PDB file of C-alpha atoms and ligand atoms in Angstrom:
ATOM      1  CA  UNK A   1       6.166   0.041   0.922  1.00  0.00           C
ATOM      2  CA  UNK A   2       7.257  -3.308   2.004  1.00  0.00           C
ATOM      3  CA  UNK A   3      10.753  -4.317   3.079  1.00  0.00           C
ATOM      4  CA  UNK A   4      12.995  -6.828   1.655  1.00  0.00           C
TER       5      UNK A   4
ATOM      6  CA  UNK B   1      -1.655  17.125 -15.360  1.00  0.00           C
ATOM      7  CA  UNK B   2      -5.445  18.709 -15.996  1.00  0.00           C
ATOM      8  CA  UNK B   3      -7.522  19.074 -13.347  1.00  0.00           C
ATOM      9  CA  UNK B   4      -9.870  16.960 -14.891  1.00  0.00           C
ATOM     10  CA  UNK B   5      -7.557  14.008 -14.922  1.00  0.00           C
ATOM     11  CA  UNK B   6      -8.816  11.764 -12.438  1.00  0.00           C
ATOM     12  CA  UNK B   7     -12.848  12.438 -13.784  1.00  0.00           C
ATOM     13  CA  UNK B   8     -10.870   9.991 -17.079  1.00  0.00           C
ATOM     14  CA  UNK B   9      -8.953   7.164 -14.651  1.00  0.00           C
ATOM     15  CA  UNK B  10      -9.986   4.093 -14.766  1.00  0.00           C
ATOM     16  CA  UNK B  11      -9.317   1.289 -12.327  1.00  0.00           C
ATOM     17  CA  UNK B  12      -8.459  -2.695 -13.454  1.00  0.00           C
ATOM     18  CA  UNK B  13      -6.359  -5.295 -11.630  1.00  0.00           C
ATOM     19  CA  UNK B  14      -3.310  -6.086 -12.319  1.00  0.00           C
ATOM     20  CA  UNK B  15      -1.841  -9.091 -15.082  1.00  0.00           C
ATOM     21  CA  UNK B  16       0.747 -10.786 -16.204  1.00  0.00           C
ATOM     22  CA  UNK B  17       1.836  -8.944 -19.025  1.00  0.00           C
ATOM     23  CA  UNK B  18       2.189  -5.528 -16.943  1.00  0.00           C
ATOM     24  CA  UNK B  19       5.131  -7.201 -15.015  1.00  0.00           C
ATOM     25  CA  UNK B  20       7.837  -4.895 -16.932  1.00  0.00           C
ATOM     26  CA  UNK B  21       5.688  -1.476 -16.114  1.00  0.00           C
ATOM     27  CA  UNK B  22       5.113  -2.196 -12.847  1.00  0.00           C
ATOM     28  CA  UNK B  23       8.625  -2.963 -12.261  1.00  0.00           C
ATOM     29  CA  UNK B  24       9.879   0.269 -13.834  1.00  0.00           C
ATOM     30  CA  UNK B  25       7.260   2.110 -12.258  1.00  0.00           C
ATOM     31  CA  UNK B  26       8.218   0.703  -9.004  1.00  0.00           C
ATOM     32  CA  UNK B  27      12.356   1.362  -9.788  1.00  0.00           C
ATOM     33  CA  UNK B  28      10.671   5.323  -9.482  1.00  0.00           C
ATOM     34  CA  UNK B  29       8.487   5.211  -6.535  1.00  0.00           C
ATOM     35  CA  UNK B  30      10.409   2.703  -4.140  1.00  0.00           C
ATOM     36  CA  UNK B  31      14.571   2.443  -3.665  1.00  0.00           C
ATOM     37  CA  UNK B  32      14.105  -0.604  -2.524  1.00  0.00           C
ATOM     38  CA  UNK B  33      14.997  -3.574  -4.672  1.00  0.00           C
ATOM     39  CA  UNK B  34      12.624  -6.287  -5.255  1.00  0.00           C
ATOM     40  CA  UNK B  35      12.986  -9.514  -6.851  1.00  0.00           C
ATOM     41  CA  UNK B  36      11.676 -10.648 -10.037  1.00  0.00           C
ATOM     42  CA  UNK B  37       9.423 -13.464  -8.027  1.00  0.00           C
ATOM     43  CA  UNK B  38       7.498 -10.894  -6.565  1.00  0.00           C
ATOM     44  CA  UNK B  39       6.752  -9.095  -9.208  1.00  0.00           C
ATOM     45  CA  UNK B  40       5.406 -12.342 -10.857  1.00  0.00           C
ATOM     46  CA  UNK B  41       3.752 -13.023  -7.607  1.00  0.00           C
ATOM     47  CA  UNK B  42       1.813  -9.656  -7.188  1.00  0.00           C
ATOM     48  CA  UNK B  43       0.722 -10.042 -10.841  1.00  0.00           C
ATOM     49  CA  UNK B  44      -0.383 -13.068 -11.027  1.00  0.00           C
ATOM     50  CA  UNK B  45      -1.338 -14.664  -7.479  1.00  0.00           C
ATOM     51  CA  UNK B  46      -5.071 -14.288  -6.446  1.00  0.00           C
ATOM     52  CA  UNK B  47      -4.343 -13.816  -2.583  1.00  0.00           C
ATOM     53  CA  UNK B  48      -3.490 -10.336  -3.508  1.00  0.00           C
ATOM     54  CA  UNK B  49      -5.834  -7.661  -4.588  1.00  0.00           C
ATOM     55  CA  UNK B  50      -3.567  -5.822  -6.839  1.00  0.00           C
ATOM     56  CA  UNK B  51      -5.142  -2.569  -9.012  1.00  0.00           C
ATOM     57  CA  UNK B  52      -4.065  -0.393 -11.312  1.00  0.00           C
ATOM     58  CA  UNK B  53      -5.152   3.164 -12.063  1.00  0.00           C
ATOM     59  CA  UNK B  54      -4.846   3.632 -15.584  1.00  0.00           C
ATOM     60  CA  UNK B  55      -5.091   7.351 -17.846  1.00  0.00           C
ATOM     61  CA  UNK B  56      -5.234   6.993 -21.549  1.00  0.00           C
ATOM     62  CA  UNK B  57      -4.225   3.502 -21.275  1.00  0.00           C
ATOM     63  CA  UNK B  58      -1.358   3.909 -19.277  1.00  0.00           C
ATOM     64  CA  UNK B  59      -0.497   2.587 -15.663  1.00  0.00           C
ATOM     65  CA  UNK B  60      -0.224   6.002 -13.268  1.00  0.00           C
ATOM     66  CA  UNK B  61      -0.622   4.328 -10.498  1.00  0.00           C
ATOM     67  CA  UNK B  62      -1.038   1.097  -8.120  1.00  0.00           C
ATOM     68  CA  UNK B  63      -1.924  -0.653  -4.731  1.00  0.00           C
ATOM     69  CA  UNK B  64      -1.154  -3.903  -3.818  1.00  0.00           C
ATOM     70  CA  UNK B  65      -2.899  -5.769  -0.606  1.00  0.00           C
ATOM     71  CA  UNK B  66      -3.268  -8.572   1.248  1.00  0.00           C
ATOM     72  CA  UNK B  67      -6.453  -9.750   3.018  1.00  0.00           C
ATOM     73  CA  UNK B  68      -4.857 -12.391   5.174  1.00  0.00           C
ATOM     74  CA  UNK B  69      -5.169 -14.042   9.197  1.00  0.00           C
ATOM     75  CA  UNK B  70      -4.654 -12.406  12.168  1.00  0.00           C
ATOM     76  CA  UNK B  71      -2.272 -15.151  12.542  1.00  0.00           C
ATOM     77  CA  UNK B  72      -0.108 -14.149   9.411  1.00  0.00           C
ATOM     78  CA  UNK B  73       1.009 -10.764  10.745  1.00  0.00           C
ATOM     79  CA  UNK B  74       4.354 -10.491  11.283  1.00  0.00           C
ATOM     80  CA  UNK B  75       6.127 -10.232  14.857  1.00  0.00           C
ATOM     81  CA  UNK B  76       7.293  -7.005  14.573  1.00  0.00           C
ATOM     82  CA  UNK B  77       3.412  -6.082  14.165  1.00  0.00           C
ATOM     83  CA  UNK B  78       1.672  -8.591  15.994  1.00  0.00           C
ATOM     84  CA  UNK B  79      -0.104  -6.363  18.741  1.00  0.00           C
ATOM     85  CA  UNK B  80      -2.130  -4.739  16.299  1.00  0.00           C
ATOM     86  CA  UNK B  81      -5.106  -6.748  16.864  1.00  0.00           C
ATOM     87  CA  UNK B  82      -4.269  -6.349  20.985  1.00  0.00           C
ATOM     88  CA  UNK B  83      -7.469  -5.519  21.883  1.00  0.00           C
ATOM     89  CA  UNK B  84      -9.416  -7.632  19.253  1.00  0.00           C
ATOM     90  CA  UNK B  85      -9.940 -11.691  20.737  1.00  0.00           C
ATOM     91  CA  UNK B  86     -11.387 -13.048  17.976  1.00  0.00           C
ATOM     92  CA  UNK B  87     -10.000 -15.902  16.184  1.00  0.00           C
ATOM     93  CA  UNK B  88     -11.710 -15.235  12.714  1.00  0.00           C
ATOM     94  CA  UNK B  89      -9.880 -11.704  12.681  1.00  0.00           C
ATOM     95  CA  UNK B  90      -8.371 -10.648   9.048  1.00  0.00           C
ATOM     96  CA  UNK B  91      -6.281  -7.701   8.114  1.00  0.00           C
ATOM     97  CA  UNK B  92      -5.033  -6.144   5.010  1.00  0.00           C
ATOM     98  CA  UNK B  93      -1.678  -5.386   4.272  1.00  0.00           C
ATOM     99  CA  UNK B  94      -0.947  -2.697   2.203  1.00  0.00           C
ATOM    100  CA  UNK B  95       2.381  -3.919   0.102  1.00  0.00           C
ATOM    101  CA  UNK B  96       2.751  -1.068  -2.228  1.00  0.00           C
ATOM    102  CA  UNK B  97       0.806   2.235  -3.347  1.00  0.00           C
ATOM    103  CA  UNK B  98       2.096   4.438  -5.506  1.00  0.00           C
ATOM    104  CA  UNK B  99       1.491   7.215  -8.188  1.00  0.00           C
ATOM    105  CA  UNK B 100       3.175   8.685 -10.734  1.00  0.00           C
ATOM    106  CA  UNK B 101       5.066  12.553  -9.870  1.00  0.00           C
ATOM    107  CA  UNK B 102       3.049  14.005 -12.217  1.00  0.00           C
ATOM    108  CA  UNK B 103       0.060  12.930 -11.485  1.00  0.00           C
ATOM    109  CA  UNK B 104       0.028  13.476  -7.545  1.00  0.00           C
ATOM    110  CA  UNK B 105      -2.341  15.305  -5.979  1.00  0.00           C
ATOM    111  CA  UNK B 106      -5.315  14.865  -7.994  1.00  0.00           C
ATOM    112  CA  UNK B 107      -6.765  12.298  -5.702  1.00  0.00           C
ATOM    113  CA  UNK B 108      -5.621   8.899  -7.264  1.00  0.00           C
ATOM    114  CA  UNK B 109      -4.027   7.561  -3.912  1.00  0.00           C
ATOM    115  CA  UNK B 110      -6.898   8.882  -2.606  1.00  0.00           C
ATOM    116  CA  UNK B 111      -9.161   6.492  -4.992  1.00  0.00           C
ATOM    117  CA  UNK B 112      -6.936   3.530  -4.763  1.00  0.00           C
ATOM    118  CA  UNK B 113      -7.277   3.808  -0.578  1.00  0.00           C
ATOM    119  CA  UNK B 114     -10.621   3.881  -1.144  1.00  0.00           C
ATOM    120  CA  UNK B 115     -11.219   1.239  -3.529  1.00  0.00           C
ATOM    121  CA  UNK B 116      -8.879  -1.025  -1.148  1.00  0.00           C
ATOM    122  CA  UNK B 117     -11.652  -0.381   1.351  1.00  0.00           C
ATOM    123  CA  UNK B 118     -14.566  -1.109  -1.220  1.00  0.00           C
ATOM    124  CA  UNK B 119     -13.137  -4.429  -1.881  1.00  0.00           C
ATOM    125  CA  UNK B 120     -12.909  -5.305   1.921  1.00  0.00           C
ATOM    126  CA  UNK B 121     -16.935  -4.116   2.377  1.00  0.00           C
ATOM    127  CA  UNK B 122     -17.551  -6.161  -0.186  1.00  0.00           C
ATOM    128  CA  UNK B 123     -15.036  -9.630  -0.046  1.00  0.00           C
ATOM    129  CA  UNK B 124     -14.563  -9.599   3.643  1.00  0.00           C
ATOM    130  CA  UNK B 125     -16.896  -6.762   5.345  1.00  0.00           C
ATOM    131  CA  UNK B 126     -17.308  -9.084   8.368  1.00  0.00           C
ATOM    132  CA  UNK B 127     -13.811  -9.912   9.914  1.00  0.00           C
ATOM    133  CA  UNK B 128     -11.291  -7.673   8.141  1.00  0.00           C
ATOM    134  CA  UNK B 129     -10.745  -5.591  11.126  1.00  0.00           C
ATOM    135  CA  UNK B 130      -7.773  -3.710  10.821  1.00  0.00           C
ATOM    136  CA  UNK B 131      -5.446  -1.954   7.280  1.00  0.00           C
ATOM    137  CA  UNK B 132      -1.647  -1.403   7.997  1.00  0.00           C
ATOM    138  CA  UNK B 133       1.239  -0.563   6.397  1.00  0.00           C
ATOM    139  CA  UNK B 134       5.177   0.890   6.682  1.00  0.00           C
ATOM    140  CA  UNK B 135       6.438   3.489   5.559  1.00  0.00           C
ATOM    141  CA  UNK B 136      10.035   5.299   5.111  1.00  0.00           C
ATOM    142  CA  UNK B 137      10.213   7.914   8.762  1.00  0.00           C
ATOM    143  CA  UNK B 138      11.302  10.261   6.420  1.00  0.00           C
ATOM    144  CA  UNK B 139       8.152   9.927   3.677  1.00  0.00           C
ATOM    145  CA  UNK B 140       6.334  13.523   5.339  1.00  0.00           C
ATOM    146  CA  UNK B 141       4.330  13.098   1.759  1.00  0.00           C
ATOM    147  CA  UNK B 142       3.002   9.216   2.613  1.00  0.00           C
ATOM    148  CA  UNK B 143       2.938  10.296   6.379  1.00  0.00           C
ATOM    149  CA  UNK B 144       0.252  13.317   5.654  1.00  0.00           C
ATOM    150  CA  UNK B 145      -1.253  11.660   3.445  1.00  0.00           C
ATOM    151  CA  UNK B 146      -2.521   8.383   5.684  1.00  0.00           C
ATOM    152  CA  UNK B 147      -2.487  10.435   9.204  1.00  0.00           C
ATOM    153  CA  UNK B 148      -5.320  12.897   7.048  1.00  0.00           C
ATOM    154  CA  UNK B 149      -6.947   9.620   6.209  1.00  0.00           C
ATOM    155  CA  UNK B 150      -7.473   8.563  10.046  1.00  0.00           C
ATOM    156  CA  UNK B 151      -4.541   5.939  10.184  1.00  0.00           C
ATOM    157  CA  UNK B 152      -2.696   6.040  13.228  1.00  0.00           C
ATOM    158  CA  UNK B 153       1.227   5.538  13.928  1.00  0.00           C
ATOM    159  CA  UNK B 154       1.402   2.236  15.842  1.00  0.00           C
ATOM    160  CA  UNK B 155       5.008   1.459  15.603  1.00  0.00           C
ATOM    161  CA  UNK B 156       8.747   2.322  15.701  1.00  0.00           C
ATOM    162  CA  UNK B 157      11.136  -0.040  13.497  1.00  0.00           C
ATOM    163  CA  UNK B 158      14.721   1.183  13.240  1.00  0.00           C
ATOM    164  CA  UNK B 159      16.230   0.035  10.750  1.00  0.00           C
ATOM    165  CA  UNK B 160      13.748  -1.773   8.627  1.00  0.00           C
ATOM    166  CA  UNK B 161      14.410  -0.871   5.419  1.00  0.00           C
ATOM    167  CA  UNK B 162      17.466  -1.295   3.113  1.00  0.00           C
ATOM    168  CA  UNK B 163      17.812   1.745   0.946  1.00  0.00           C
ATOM    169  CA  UNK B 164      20.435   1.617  -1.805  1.00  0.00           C
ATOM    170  CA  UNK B 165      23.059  -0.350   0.811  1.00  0.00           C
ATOM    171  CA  UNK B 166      22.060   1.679   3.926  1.00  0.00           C
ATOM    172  CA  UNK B 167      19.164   1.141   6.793  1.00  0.00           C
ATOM    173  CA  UNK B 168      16.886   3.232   7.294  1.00  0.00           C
ATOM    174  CA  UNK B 169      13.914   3.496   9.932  1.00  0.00           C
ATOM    175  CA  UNK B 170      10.464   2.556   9.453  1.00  0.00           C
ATOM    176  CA  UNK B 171       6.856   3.223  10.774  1.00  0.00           C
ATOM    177  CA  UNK B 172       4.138   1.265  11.019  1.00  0.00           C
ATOM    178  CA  UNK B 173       0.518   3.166  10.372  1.00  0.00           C
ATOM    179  CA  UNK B 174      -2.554   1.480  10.934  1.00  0.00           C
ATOM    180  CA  UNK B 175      -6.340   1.757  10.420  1.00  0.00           C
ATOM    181  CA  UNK B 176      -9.035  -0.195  12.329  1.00  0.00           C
ATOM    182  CA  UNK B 177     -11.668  -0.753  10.202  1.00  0.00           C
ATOM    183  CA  UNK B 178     -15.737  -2.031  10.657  1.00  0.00           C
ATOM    184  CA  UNK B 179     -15.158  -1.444  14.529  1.00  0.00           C
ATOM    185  CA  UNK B 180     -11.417  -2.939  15.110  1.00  0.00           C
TER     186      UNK B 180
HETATM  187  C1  LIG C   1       4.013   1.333   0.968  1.00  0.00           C
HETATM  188  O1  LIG C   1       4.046   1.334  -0.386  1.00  0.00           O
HETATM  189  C2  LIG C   1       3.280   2.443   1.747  1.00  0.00           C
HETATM  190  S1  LIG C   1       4.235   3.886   2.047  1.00  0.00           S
HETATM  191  C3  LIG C   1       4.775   4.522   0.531  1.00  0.00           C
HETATM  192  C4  LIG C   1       3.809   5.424  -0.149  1.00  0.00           C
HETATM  193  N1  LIG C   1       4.126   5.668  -1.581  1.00  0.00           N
HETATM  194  C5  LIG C   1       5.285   6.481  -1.950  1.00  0.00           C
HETATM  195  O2  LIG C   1       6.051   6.998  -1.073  1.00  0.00           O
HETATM  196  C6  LIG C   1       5.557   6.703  -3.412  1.00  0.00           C
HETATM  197  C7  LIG C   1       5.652   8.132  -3.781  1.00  0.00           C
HETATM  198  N2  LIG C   1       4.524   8.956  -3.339  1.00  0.00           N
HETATM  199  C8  LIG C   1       3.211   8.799  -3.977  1.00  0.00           C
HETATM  200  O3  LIG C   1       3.035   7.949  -4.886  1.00  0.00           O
HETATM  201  C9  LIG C   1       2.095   9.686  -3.492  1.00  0.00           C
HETATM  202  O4  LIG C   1       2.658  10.829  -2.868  1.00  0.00           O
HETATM  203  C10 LIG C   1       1.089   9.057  -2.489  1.00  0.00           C
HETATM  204  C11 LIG C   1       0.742   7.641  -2.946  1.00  0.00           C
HETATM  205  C12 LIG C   1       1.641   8.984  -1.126  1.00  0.00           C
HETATM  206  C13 LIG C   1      -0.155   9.926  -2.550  1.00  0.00           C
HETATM  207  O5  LIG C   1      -0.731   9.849  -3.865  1.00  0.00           O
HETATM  208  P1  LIG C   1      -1.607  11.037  -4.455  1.00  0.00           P
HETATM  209  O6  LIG C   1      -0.807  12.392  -4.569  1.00  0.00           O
HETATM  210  O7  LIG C   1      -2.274  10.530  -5.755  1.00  0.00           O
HETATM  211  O8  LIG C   1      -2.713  11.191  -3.332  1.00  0.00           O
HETATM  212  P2  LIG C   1      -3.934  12.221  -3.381  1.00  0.00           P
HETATM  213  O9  LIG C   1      -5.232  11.558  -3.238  1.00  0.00           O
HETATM  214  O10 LIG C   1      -3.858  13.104  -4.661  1.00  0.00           O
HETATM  215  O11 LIG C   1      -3.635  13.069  -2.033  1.00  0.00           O
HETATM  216  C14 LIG C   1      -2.496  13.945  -1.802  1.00  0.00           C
HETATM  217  C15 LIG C   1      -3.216  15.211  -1.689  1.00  0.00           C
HETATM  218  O12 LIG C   1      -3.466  15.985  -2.695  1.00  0.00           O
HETATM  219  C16 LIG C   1      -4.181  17.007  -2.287  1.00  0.00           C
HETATM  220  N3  LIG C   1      -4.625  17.974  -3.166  1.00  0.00           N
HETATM  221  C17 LIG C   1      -4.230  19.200  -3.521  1.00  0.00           C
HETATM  222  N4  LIG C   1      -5.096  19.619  -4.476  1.00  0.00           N
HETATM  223  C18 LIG C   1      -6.027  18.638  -4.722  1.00  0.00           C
HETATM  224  C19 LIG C   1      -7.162  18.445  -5.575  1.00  0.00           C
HETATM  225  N5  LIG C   1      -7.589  19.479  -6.489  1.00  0.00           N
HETATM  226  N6  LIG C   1      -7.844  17.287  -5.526  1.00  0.00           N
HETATM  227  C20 LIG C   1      -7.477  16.305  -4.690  1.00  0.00           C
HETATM  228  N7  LIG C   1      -6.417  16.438  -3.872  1.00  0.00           N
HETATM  229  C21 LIG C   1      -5.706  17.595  -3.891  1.00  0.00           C
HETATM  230  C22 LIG C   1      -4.503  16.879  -0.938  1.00  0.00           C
HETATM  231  O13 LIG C   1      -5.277  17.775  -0.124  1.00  0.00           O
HETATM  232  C23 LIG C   1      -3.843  15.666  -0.532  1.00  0.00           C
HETATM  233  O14 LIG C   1      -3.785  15.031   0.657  1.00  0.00           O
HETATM  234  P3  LIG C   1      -2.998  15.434   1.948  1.00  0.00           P
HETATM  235  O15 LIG C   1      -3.969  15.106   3.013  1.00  0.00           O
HETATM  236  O16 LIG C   1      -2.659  16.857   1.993  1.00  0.00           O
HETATM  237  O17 LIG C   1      -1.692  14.537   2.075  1.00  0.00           O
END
């Protein structure tokens, strides 16, 4: 899950 | 869900028209807000391997990866590749994976892991060395999940995630692939  | 559910999932990447499905399917899986750009971007761009499992039709679930550079990891993860000197050294990111609630547990993360690591054997057997990703400290689900699949914690990142207007911590977890 990648962050903003 | 049968038991027999993942014997009829099928696999296909990812287009332009399922921009509206992955986004709603991504409003479930992730509370983390992203933009319309990269939606278009993860649907449409070619850098990005980005499949779909599909049942009767339907999206259930997704990964999204990048096959990039040692060069274009970012600094918070740059000492992943530590031990590796070689110039021509590629990773994969893993952006997203996901599956619908329902349909957990019948080995369709499992698949889309694995057909992640197909593609590399067969686009980029030679230098993609290492897979890595983040994750929520408090995911126990995602956490068993990769640390059952041989990926190893590698990093602490307080803080790294907005969730709903409050930080949260992060992990990185990372597997070295065709001998790191
Ligand atoms: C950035 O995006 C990376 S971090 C975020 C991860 N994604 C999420 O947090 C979103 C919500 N969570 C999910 O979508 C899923 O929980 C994930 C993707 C994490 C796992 O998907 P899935 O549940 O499809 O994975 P799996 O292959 O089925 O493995 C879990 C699991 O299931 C069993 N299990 C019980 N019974 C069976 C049968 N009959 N067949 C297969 N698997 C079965 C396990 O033993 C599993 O693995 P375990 O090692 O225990 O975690």
């Amino acid at each position: 899950m990648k962050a903003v | 869900v049968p038991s027999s559910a993942l014997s009829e999932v099928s696999l296909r990447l990812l287009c332009h028209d399922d921009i509206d499905t992955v986004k709603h399917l991504c409003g479930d899986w992730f509370p983390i807000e992203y933009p319309d750009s990269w939606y278009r971007d993860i649907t449409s761009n070619k850098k990005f391997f980005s499949l779909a499992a599909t049942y009767r039709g339907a999206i259930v679930g997704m990964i999204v990866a990048e096959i990039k550079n040692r060069t274009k990891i970012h600094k918070e993860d740059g000492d992943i590749l530590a031990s590796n000197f070689s110039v021509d050294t590629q990773v994969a990111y893993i952006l997203s994976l996901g599956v619908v609630k329902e349909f957990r547990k019948h080995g369709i993360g499992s698949l889309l892991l694995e057909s992640l690591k197909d593609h590399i054997s067969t686009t980029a057997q030679d230098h993609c060395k290492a897979i890595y990703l983040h994750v929520l400290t408090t995911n126990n689900t995602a956490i068993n999940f990769y640390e059952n699949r041989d990926f190893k914690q590698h990093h602490y990142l307080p803080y790294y995630y907005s969730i709903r207007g409050v930080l949260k911590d992060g992990f990185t977890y990372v597997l070295y692939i065709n001998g790191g």
